[PDB]
Amino acid sequence: SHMANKREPAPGWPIVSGEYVVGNPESCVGVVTLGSHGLEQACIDAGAAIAGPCHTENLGIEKVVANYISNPNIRFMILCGSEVQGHITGQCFKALWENGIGDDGGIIGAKGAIPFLENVNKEAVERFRRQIVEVVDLIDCEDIGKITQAIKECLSKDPGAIDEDPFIIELE
């Protein structure tokens, strides 16, 4: 029963190049599709701000964190698609949000092979953790019908942008 407040993303958003499709930049929902193919367009059509795969539990996670915190409008992350064996990227991303990172850049509680953030610092991680108000765990789910329902549920709960400027973290 509300009109959610909105902010301008960083100029050029998404600034970090990668494998994703861009949607409505004022959408409050981002979607990570892990190891699956073919889910991205449907997520954008459902209303996502951005949707794309995430293969590695280091660089992959950094590019997602960097492109979400440069857009204050994004308040939800949906994790869906097949888990990556060895990388276990979905579990690593959940652990980042739940626990943060160590002094060494290691994701606390992560089960993947190389869960280290070399470029994304403690301040950027804490911005990610207060900007994203909820992580929706649909890990290993490839039902586009369920995933789109999750997207619309988030959109109906839009709490508006975080009241901070875009956060710019430089990657490699």
Side-chain angles (χ1 to χ4, degrees):
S1 161
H2 218 289
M3 313 180 213
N5 190 65
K6 295 299 163 182
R7 276 172 161 270
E8 279 288 314
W13 188 83
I15 299 170
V16 172
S17 298
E19 298 300 321
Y20 49 78
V21 176
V22 182
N24 186 337
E26 296 190 341
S27 173
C28 67
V29 189
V31 186
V32 174
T33 59
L34 304 176
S36 285
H37 299 86
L39 277 25
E40 292 98 3
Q41 267 307 322
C43 294
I44 298 307
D45 297 341
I50 178 175
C54 186
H55 310 289
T56 59
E57 71 280 20
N58 35 67
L59 176 63
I61 294 183
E62 291 197 327
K63 298 203 177 182
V64 173
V65 171
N67 279 330
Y68 282 24
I69 60 180
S70 60
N71 188 340
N73 297 309
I74 301 175
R75 314 303 313 279
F76 302 96
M77 181 172 68
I78 300 176
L79 296 168
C80 61
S82 317
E83 263 287 39
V84 194
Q85 283 136 317
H87 299 283
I88 331 181
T89 298
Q91 189 277 338
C92 291
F93 226 145
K94 274 177 47 152
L96 177 59
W97 185 75
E98 287 180 359
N99 310 317
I101 56 161
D103 289 321
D104 59 344
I107 300 172
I108 294 156
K111 297 178 189 175
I114 308 165
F116 285 91
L117 312 185
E118 171 95 352
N119 299 96
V120 176
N121 59 25
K122 173 70 144 174
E123 187 181 352
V125 170
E126 291 304 300
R127 171 53 181 263
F128 186 81
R129 291 176 77 211
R130 63 170 185 277
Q131 181 175 326
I132 297 305
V133 303
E134 169 171 2
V135 168
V136 180
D137 180 355
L138 286 172
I139 294 173
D140 281 321
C141 176
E142 297 178 274
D143 190 79
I144 296 193
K146 287 193 173 81
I147 303 167
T148 56
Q149 185 49 41
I151 293 167
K152 298 166 171 284
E153 279 169 20
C154 286
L155 295 171
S156 308
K157 297 183 170 68
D158 187 355
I162 190 171
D163 195 16
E164 295 178 22
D165 292 328
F167 196 109
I168 310 291
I169 180 87
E170 294 179 43
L171 300 189
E172 189 79 22

